[PDB]
Amino acid sequence: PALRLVDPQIQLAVTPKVYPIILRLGSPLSLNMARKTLNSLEDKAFQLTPIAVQMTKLATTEELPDEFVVVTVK
Amino acid sequence: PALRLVDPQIQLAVTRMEGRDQNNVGPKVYPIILRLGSPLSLNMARKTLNSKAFQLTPIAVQMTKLAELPDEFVVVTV
Ligand SMILES: CCCCCCCCC
């Protein structure tokens, strides 16, 4: 269990207002940024450059912000 | 398993912030595509007074299965 906080560079936008992200990880998570910049003479492909997400196991509950979103993975 | 596109209701906001300090570009918002191996819940949380306690408001993510993908988007892989 052990709720972990996502670094402030990765936040959720809900419609807008942007919220910190808390993870209740039951399964590992991956994050890839996709862009259509693999360009041929007629087509274009997607390149998946993975994003490194710094996660911090929440030390004490009093570190939690006043409002945030919680992503729970079974 | 399969791929689901989350509507612009929910999107991921990435802030580079830097190798010069930008600090004025702010966040860049990308549509989310999910590669669910196991299901995902998303609850908004707000602090309610106890003294320690948070008011969890659920959020219905209306993900749509593709068979139409934008040029820029992130892929959440579980
Ligand atoms: C780094 C955690 C990303 C949060 C996943 C977004 C799920 C939206 C339904």
Q: How far is Cα A73 from Cα A69, in angstroms, rounded to an integer? A: 13
How many angstroms is it from B34 CA to the middle of ligand 1? 8
Contact between A20 and A69 under an 8 Å Cβ cutoff? The reply is yes
Q: What is the dihedral of CA B29, B23, A59, A18, to 10 degrees?
A: -30
Token duo for residue B38: 């196991």
CA A4 centroid distance within chain: 12
Nearest to A67 by CA among B28, B56, B13, B40: B56
| Domain spans of chain B, in order of start | 4-77
Q: Strand A21-24 relative to strand A67-73: parallel, antiparallel, unpaired?
A: parallel
Method: X-ray
Q: What is the dihedral of CA A52, A56, A57, A60, to 10 degrees?
A: -160
| Chain B, window 17-36: residues with a beta carbon less than 8 angstroms from a chain A beta carbon | 17, 27, 29-30, 33, 35
Residue of B nearest to A51 (CA): B74
